[PDB]
Design an enzyme around this catalytic site. Structure first.
Site, short mmCIF file in Angstrom:
data_model
loop_
_atom_site.label_atom_id
_atom_site.label_comp_id
_atom_site.label_asym_id
_atom_site.label_seq_id
_atom_site.Cartn_x
_atom_site.Cartn_y
_atom_site.Cartn_z
N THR A 1 0.48 42.87 36.70
CA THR A 1 1.10 43.78 37.70
C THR A 1 0.21 44.96 38.04
O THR A 1 -0.38 45.60 37.17
CB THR A 1 2.43 44.34 37.17
OG1 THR A 1 3.42 43.31 37.21
CG2 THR A 1 2.91 45.52 38.00
B1 LIG Z 1 3.96 43.10 36.01
O1 LIG Z 1 3.04 42.72 35.12
O2 LIG Z 1 4.58 44.21 35.56
C1 LIG Z 1 5.03 41.93 36.10
C2 LIG Z 1 6.20 42.16 37.15
C3 LIG Z 1 7.57 42.83 36.79
C4 LIG Z 1 7.40 44.29 36.34
C5 LIG Z 1 8.49 42.81 38.02
N1 LIG Z 1 5.54 41.65 34.78
C6 LIG Z 1 6.14 40.45 34.53
O3 LIG Z 1 6.23 39.59 35.40
C7 LIG Z 1 6.68 40.13 33.13
C8 LIG Z 1 5.55 39.86 32.05
C9 LIG Z 1 4.36 40.88 32.00
C10 LIG Z 1 3.04 40.46 32.41
C11 LIG Z 1 1.93 41.37 32.37
C12 LIG Z 1 2.13 42.71 31.91
C13 LIG Z 1 3.44 43.15 31.50
C14 LIG Z 1 4.55 42.23 31.54
N2 LIG Z 1 7.38 38.84 33.29
C15 LIG Z 1 8.75 38.84 33.38
O4 LIG Z 1 9.39 39.88 33.32
C16 LIG Z 1 9.55 37.60 33.61
C17 LIG Z 1 9.00 36.32 33.69
N3 LIG Z 1 9.83 35.26 33.93
C18 LIG Z 1 11.18 35.40 34.09
C19 LIG Z 1 11.73 36.68 34.02
N4 LIG Z 1 10.90 37.73 33.78
#
Ligand SMILES: *[B]([O])([O])[C]([C][C]([C])[C])[N]C(=O)[C]([C]C1=[C][C]=[C][C]=[C]1)[N]C(=O)C1=[C]N=[C][C]=N1
Ligand SMILES: *[B]([O])([O])[C]([C][C]([C])[C])[N]C(=O)[C]([C]C1=[C][C]=[C][C]=[C]1)[N]C(=O)C1=[C]N=[C][C]=N1
Lengths: 196, 204, 233, 244, 243, 250, 222, 244
Positions: A1
């Site tokens: 993200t």
């Molecule tokens: B980003 O990295 O923050 C991203 C988007 C979110 C804040 C809307 N994070 C995610 O997608 C998270 C995992 C993650 C990855 C990298 C850094 C921190 C966190 N995934 C999920 O929340 C997820 C995945 N599948 C189903 C539901 N939720």
């Protein structure tokens, strides 16, 4: 993200990538990480989708009840509510949140709330896994009181770099402009920012 | 370790022509040690039959519970509970303990008294309902039972035939499971009558 | 009238009075007289103890809250014990958590608030005791008068109980005089005894009948009874 | 405060009586009469429905005779709604007992329990007592056929024949006059109908104003059977017994 | 016995005097109000009386902004009116949080009626001496008017009025609709509906109004707001140039 | 604060009367007449929409409510009490039955639940009995069609036909004359309309009258298709028009 | 498991396979992963069977009560808020992964909810172990402005990708169509591409093959 | 009948709540106190009857601060006043803690309002025996309020309560008329001292002690502070002078 909020001459702009992942699988490629907690107070979500969504929904509820009773809340107040939730529940949350809002007396403001639950008011703020890759760029290219066009460009370049290096970031770049004029939604596709 | 592999046991139910059958083994052990060879796993409330495999103490507790519930049901409804309704009562009762479940594998069989339609159902330890038209298997020899049933079975068998079929399915599956056997009982259910037969099988 | 509005403290009379509270105040008047006065260095409490029979004791009327605070009571002893014990805790919480001695003025505020809660809720009753609190804090000597209604006032001197008006007049007269008895406790105490005697009538203050307390600049609140007060009779 | 409006339902009168219990009883006395007669081969429960109409659906009706267990039943006199609250808890105590000991609950144990619930509303809680009186008719393998009675006070006792509700004195005298230790269920049935027939406050005594039940151990079986008579069944027994 | 007039239990006639007396309290402020429905707006007019000269006229109001879309006017003592307002705001905020959409005017009305019905049945709670008129342009029902009382009663109106001289306002409005044959002011602008409202408020009451004698609230698609002294004046002028 | 009214507000009088329940029935007597008639293939419940002002919208106020797809209620007495009773009834039908057996409760049991709620408000501390009497009509597979009445005491009874409220006595009498065990649903609706006429003072039409039935399944009122065992609700409220069409053959 | 959701020009459609598993064993060859929250709001569930069924009925029940209380048709965003806040409350312990769709006064909707409580919006979605085969098809054939029939085909083909390529998915295809102005239409076993071939032999035993020790009649009647 | 005035949450037939009205009597029987809103703040003042010479002068303070920008003064049962400030102080801390910004005066006013109104809903509590004048400076101006025992409150240009509320209200009405442009902090301070000396005639028997406090965006920076020394004496004089 990859998310960031930048204050400029006319107010403030929020930007984010649109990717949510489950390991290396892109669960959602058109995610909207720019969430509205009030007419002119929005936030940037990073970390747990469930955690940040729940937090956001609660803040929205709070500001709506705040307005009902005391009128429009300051951006500082919105950051306080986010902080109160994030700090008091630090043990059970994984939420990196950036609060940006446009006030007429205060113009545009930005408060970043990282993991711990601490609050930080800044000219601009960047967060999310991809932010690490653009610390140098942003620090070298940010100037105060830029124009909406300059700002949109700053966010667009910064994020495309973040998206370039961070696998957790990708899809489209979304932006939300907050000024006295109102609210504007911007979207930039791969074919554009990938070649910047 | 596995509450579902301490006591051992199996139950299987099949649908035939205007009838249903439900059978169980009689073993009750403690790991390798056989303890009782008269532990039946099939009970009934009115015309609804229920077999329970799994941890013996829960098998007993659940039976006492459903007797209790079907009793109050009959007193209020002024009628006997039906297979379909009971299935629901079993499911909701199991989920009530979602995070501290009874380690059992329930099986319901019976004929709807009003429609005369044959009915059977299986459940996991937390209530998920499996309503099959042919057969349901449960217990420590469920793989073997699945194998026997999937081959031996065929639709609309007559009571006398369904008996041969369900008996062979149970018997041969139990003989491949160290924790099952030690006797077996089979129930052939029809709208009007219910016959109960004890089978002759290996005692090792 | 009154009879229909004095059932409990939660009820206001047609004129805006709280009879239960007024009745409580009455318990104070029926209580043995006690006096309080201070200079700028000390604060004295002279209390006339009352005895049941001539075979009984002259019930204690002076309680110490802290090394710098204490009070004299007139009314229901049990209530004084409850209120004094509460004050002991507040005085104590202040030292433990903030390593700070509780300001006499602030202790008055606490008593007022505690007393008030018992005059707005159903089921409870007002306190039936008056209290005179003396102390030496970061702003000098202090004297306070506590009333069950919750009213606490800071004075130079005063008295509560039966015939207390005698002493009170005497003090309101001797003011300019005792207020300057600085650096001389015995003189303040004597003035305290001459004040409490202005409310005598029945007998005369005796040795086991007199009780005095002093506090100030370099004097941790201490109580004197009997022999120790003989040199004042 | 509230104290002002508190009836103080659980206090003693200067004569050491319990006001509310006394008035609840007074209430019960106006309820349709219920009768319980115990024979050697069974038990009979009969009750008169208070207030009825041409349109009252009697077929789907029940207001005085309720099944508690498969061996225990009760006749009600008083507030039906109050009675249902007690009946349901009653049915539960029975199932609990059954689940704990794997034996049907002895009749007195169930009666003592309910009576204890009633007694409670008498000594604490500040609530009104239940305006109800029960006639318990049941069977168990320790005392055979039993007949009990409980009222608002929480007191209970056993009988060979008894009545609750309206005109109890009148009905009790009649029972104490034609009852005999060696009676038979069919004799009991007739005695029950006669008593009601003579204590009714209505014109005649028709079937649409009656509830009937018997707890017998049908010889051709060996178990206990409860039979709540159907309108038609009550109409028949009404003719035979010579009341047409 | 005679306490069947102090707490909410039945009187031998099956009445609840405390509820009846609470209704009496609703007229204590001697103010009248009325609401009408436009083509796509809802308007509420209410008399504004500021007796004391020492008062800050800007803080004397009986109209409330419950939510971005719900508006509420109260007939009764201000302390009870504010208690009802705070609650309604809380209720509206929570509904949005839990169900994901804005609480409908009629639903919030029902919710408050139920809350009032409770003070009617429970002895320790006194009824609130107020009548609440809720208005908005519901996304499903359009212009809406719902009013609740101390009895826990509530219903929707085509138009309505509340206060000491409620009957005169009502019959006035009744007559207009018997005539027009429709159930609403057929006007496209809320300004004319506000004007229609003030006009009839004058006929029925036989009184002329200055910009500081009235208080006006308007509900439109996605928003409810109240007019200012000057917004009202602009209204008063317009009506003047017709009579 | 805190409800300190933990004692009963309804107690026994020396005569054995329970004043509050008596008074509650008195409140019910003042209520607008409502009735119910059971036919061989249905049940009908009806009441009069006593609009309390011409400016009020009579539609926004339904006196006839659906509790389950096969059960409906109507009343006489204090409308607000009825309203909260309907909410509780609908919820108890779920919490105490659907969520357990996966099917809606049969009429007698739901009625039983309601009766319980009312009985409690007769003995619990700090409350007054409910000031309403309900007429509940429904259908269930093993019991068929049924009609009940629940009073403020918590007592309830089954009826072939009955009326409650203002002119109940006269109405009950008129029904005894017209009722028989061979009535078809339309016949009952007709009789219901005739009975309610004697009770209505002013206008008598599909806008001043509220009538509903418990009859056949309405697959058209289901909202979806695909599940053979779901044929639609038996509860159906008649339309202002449907009523008028019948008033013409009155 | 393979469940999908596809929006079309005037509504929304959802489909799912019919296999339930325990380890490598197929527990149910024709279970129903399509649930009804309200007449026009259906849900597709993946994860823990008991959990998807339970959460779906609970919210369904409350939605019914909320509908009765507000005299309004239920909205999909309400089912979505109740479901998500419930799942969130249980920190993922209730293994329910849902695709919730439907039509209501405000239009047609398509959402997804994960066990932990996060929700997502899109024109096409899939969840489950078949999720990747399905999504590959969706990302390859989806286009905006699909007709009801095109949507059924797309959704149905996505489920098939799961059935054929995912071991966790199999048997039949269930579909439910929710169109803006019509009744929702549930198509149980809309496709049954896995019928078992006729067995090679009959194993009907000659009566008496089984040795019996004792026999008796069972008493049902009371 | 009668008795409508013995229980707090009871409505009399005329829709009033007598206990609240009685509480008011307690307020009228108290010292007089006022509030004067000015061009950028507010001034508070109150009368302190010198019961005797024994009272230490300037000690028994009555005016109270809430948070750092709000001032509160009241007449009636003093203890009840402290109880209300305590609540207000908690009320304020709570607000700042969640919203960060110190609480707006209007918001603070409703907090006290809702709380006071609460004490007129149950018979288990007594209404407050005080009328409170309070206010302060905030994001958009100065605000002056007066809260009654009924929970009623409004924003004022000037306010008074207690024994000489009429004298004060009179003096206040004059100022309002002869200063449409608004008084000043400095001026309001002297003016206040005067209104108090005048309103003291309705109690001219006992000697008193004046107390003033103010909150002005320019004179105190929006913070509430007590008037002491020179500025106080200057005001006492301005009053003592015009009192003749
Ligand atoms: B980003 O990295 O923050 C991203 C988007 C979110 C804040 C809307 N994070 C995610 O997608 C998270 C995992 C993650 C990855 C990298 C850094 C921190 C966190 N995934 C999920 O929340 C997820 C995945 N599948 C189903 C539901 N939720
Ligand atoms: B699918 O993968 O989602 C599928 C369908 C279900 C959600 C309707 N899942 C299952 O069938 C689950 C897999 C599972 C196994 C073990 C722990 C958690 C999940 N199986 C079951 O729910 C189940 C139910 N009853 C008996 C056996 N298995």
């Amino acid at each position: 993200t990859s998310i960031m909020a930048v204050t400029f001459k006319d107010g403030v702009i929020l930007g984010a990538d649109s990717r949510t992942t489950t390991g290396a699988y892109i669960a959602n490629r058109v995610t909207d990480k720019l969430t509205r907690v009030h007419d002119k107070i929005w936030c940037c979500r990073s970390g747990s989708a469930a955690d940040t969504q729940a937090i956001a929904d609660i803040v929205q509820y709070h500001l709506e009840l705040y307005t009902s009773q005391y009128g429009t809340p300051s951006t500082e107040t919105a950051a306080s509510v986010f902080k109160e939730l994030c700090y008091e529940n630090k043990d059970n949350l994984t939420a990196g949140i950036i609060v940006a809002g446009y006030d007429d007396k205060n113009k545009g403001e930005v408060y970043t709330i990282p993991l711990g639950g601490s609050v930080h008011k800044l000219p601009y703020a960047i967060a999310g896994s991809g932010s690490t890759f653009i610390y140098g760029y942003c620090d070298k290219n940010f100037r105060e009181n830029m124009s909406k066009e300059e700002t949109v460009d700053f966010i667009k370049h910064s994020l495309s770099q973040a998206i370039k290096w961070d696998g957790s970031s990708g899809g489209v770049i979304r932006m939300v402009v907050l000024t006295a004029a109102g609210v504007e939604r911007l979207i930039f596709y791969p074919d554009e920012y990938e070649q910047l | 370790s596995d509450p579902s592999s301490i006591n051992g046991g199996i139950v299987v139910a099949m649908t035939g022509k205007d009838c249903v059958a439900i059978a169980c083994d009689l073993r009750l052990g403690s790991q390798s040690l056989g303890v009782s060879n008269k532990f039946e796993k099939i009970f009934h409330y009115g015309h609804v039959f229920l077999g329970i495999t799994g941890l013996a103490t829960d098998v007993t507790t659940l039976n006492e519970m459903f007797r209790y519930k079907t009793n109050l049901y009959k007193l209020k409804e002024e009628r006997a509970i039906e297979p379909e309704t009971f299935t629901q009562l079993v499911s909701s009762s199991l989920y009530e303990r979602r995070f501290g479940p009874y380690f059992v594998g329930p099986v319901v069989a019976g004929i709807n008294s009003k429609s005369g339609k044959p009915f059977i159902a299986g459940f996991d330890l937390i209530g998920c309902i499996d309503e099959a038209k042919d057969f349901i298997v449960s217990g420590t020899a469920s793989d073997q039972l699945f194998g026997m049933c999937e081959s031996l079975y065929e639709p609309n068998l007559e009571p006398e035939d369904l008996f041969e079929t369900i008996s062979q399915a149970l018997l041969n599956a139990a003989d491949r499971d160290a924790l099952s056997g030690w006797g077996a009982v089979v129930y052939i259910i029809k709208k009007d009558e219910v016959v109960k037969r004890y089978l002759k099988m290996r005692q090792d | 009238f009154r009879n229909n509005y004095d059932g409990d403290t939660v009820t206001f009379s047609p004129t805006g009075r709280l009879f239960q509270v007024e009745y409580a105040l009455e318990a104070i008047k029926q209580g043995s007289v006690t006096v309080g006065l201070r200079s700028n260095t000390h604060a004295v409490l002279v209390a006339l103890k009352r005895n049941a029979d001539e075979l009984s004791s002259y019930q204690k009327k002076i309680i110490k809250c802290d090394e710098h605070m204490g009070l004299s009571l007139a009314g229901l002893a049990p209530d004084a014990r409850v209120l004094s014990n509460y004050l002991r805790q507040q005085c104590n919480y202040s030292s433990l958590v903030f390593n700070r001695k509780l300001a006499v003025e602030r202790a008055g505020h606490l008593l007022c608030d505690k007393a008030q809660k018992n005059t707005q809720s159903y089921g409870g009753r007002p306190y039936g005791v008056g209290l005179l609190i003396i102390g030496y804090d970061k702003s000098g000597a202090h004297l306070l008068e506590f009333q069950p209604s919750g009213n606490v006032t800071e004075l130079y001197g005063t008295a509560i109980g039966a015939r207390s008006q005698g002493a009170k007049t005497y003090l309101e007269r001797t003011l300019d005089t005792f207020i300057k008895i600085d650096g001389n406790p015995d003189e303040l105490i004597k003035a305290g005894v001459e004040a409490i005697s202005q409310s005598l009538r029945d007998e005369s203050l005796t040795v086991d009948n007199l009780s005095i307390a002093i506090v100030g600049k370099d004097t941790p609140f201490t109580i004197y009874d009997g022999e120790a007060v003989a040199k004042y009779i | 405060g509230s104290r002002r409006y508190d009836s103080r339902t659980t206090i003693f009168s200067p004569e050491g009586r319990l006001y509310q219990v006394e008035y609840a009883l007074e209430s019960i006395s106006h309820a349709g009469t219920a009768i319980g007669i115990m024979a050697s081969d069974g038990i009979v429960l009969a009750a008169e429905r208070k207030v009825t109409s041409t349109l009252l659906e009697q077929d789907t009706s029940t207001e005085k005779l309720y099944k508690l267990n498969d061996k225990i039943a009760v006749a009600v006199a008083g507030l039906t709604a109050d009675a249902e609250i007690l009946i349901n808890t009653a049915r539960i105590h029975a199932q609990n007992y059954l689940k704990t000991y794997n034996e049907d609950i002895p009749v007195e144990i169930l009666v003592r329990r309910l009576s204890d619930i009633k007694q409670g509303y008498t000594q604490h809680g500040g609530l009104r007592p239940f305006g109800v009186s029960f006639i318990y008719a049941g069977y168990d393998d320790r005392y055979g056929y039993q007949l009990y009675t409980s009222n608002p006070s929480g007191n209970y006792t056993g009988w060979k024949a008894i009545s609750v509700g309206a005109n109890t004195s009148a009905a009790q005298t009649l029972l104490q006059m034609d009852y005999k230790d060696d009676m038979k269920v069919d004799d009991a049935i007739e005695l029950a109908l006669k008593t009601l027939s003579k204590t009714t406050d209505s014109s005649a005594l028709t079937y649409d104003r009656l509830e009937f039940a018997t707890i017998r151990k049908g010889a051709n079986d060996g178990e206990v059977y409860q039979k709540i008579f159907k309108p038609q069944e009550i109409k028949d027994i009404l003719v035979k017994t010579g009341i047409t | 016995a005679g306490y069947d007039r102090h707490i909410t239990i039945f009187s031998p006639e099956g009445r609840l005097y405390q509820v009846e007396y609470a209704f009496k309290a609703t007229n204590q402020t001697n103010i009248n109000s009325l609401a009408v429905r436009g083509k796509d707006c809802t308007v509420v007019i209410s008399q504004k009386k500021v007796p004391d000269k020492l008062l800050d006229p800007t803080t004397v109001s009986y109209i409330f902004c419950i939510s971005r879309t719900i508006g509420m006017v109260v007939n009764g003592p201000i302390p009870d009116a504010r208690n009802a307002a705070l609650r309604a705001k809380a209720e509206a905020a929570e509904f949005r949080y839990k169900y994901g959409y804005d609480m409908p005017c009629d639903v919030l009305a029902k919710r408050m009626a139920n809350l009032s019905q409770i003070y009617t049945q429970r002895a320790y709670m006194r009824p609130l001496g107020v009548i609440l008129t809720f208005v908005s342009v519901d996304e499903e029902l359009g212009p809406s008017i719902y009013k609740t009382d101390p009895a826990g009663y509530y219903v929707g109106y085509k138009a309505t009025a509340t206060g000491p001289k409620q009957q005169e306002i009502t019959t006035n409005l009744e007559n207009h609709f018997k005539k027009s044959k429709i159930d609403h002011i057929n006007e496209e602008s809320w300004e004319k509906v506000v004007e229609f409202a003030i006009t009839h408020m004058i006929d029925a009451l036989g009184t002329e109004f200055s910009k500081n004698d009235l208080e006006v609230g308007v509900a439109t698609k996605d928003k409810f707001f109240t007019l200012s002294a000057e917004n009202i004046e602009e209204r008063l002028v317009a009506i003047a140039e017709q009579d | 604060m805190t409800d300190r009214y933990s004692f009963s507000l309804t107690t026994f009088s020396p005569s054995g009367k329970l004043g509050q329940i008596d008074y509650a029935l008195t409140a019910v007597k003042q209520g607008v007449t409502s009735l119910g008639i059971k036919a061989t293939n249905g049940v009908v419940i009806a009441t009069e929409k006593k609009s309390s002002s011409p400016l009020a919208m009579s539609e926004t106020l339904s006196k006839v409510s659906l509790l389950t797809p096969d059960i409906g209620a109507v009343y006489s007495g204090m409308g607000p009490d009825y309203r909260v009773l309907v909410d509780k009834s609908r919820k108890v039908a779920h919490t105490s039955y659907k969520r357990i057996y996966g099917e809606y409760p049969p009429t007698k049991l739901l009625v039983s639940e309601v009766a319980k709620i009312m009985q409690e408000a007769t003995q619990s501390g700090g409350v007054r009995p409910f000031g309403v009497s309900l007429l509940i009509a429904g259908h269930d597979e093993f019991n068929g069609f049924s009609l009940y009445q629940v009073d403020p005491s918590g007592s309830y009874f089954p009826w072939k036909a009955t009326a409650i409220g203002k002119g109940s006595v006269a109405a009950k009498t008129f029904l005894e004359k017209r009722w028989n065990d061979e009535l078809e649903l339309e016949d009952a609706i007709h009789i219901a309309l005739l009975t309610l006429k004697e009770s209505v003072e002013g206008e008598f039409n599909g806008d001043t009258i509220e009538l509903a039935i418990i009859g056949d399944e309405n697959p058209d009122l289901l909202g979806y298709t695909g599940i053979p065992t779901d044929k639609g609700p038996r509860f159906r409220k008649l339309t202002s028009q449907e009523i008028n069409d019948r008033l013409e053959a009155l | 498991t393979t469940i999908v959701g596809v929006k079309f020009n005037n509504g929304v459609v959802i489909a799912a396979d019919t296999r339930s598993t325990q380890g490598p064993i197929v527990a149910d060859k024709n279970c129903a992963k399509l649930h009804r929250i309200s007449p026009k709001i259906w849900c597709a569930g993946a994860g823990t069977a008991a959990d998807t069924e339970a959460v779906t009925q609970l919210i369904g029940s409350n939605i019914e009560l909320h509908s009765l209380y507000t005299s309004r048709e239920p909205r999909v965003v309400s089912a979505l808020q109740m479901l998500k806040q419930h799942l969130f409350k249980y920190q993922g312990h209730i293994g329910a992964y849902l695709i919730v769709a439907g039509v209501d006064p405000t239009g047609s909707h398509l959402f997804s909810i994960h066990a932990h409580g996060s929700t997502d919006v899109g024109y096409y979605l899939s969840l489950g172990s078949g999720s990747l085969a399905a999504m590959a098809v969706l990302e390859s054939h989806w286009k905006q402005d699909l007709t009801k029939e095109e949507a059924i085909k797309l959704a149905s083909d996505a489920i098939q990708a799961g059935i054929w390529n995912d071991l966790g998915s199999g048997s039949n295809v269930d579909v439910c169509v929710m169109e803006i102005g019509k009744d929702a239409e549930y198509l149980r076993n809309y496709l049954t591409p896995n019928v078992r071939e006729e067995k090679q032999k009959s194993y009907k035993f000659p009566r008496g093959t089984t040795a019996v020790l004792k026999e008796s009649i069972v008493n049902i009647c009371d | 009948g009668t008795g409508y005035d013995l229980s707090n949450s009871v409505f009399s037939p005329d829709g009033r709540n007598f206990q609240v009205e009685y509480a008011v009597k307690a307020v009228e029987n108290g010292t007089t106190s006022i509030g004067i809103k000015c061009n950028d703040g507010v001034v508070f003042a109150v009368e302190k009857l010198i019961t005797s010479k024994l009272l230490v002068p300037q000690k028994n303070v009555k005016i109270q601060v809430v948070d750092r920008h709000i001032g509160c003064v009241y007449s009636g049962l003093i203890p009840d006043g402290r109880h209300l400030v305590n609540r207000g102080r908690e009320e304020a801390a709570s607000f700042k803690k969640l919203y960060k910004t110190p609480i707006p005066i209007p918001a603070f006013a409703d907090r006290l309002g809702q709380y006071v109104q609460a004490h007129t809903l149950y018979n288990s509590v007594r209404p407050f025996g005080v009328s409170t004048i309070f206010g302060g400076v905030d994001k958009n101006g100065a605000h002056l309020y007066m809260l009654e025992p009924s929970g009623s409150y409004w924003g004022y240009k000037g306010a008074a309560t207690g024994k000489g509320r009429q004298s004060a209200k009179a003096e206040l009405e004059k100022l309002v008329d002869h200063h449409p442009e608004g008084l000043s902090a400095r001026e309001a301070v002297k003016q206040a001292a005067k209104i108090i000396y005048l309103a003291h005639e309705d109690n001219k028997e006992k000697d008193f002690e004046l107390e003033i406090s103010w909150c002005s965006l320019s004179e105190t920076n929006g913070l509430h502070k007590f008037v002491k020394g020179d500025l106080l004496q200057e005001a006492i004089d301005f009053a003592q002078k015009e009192i003749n």
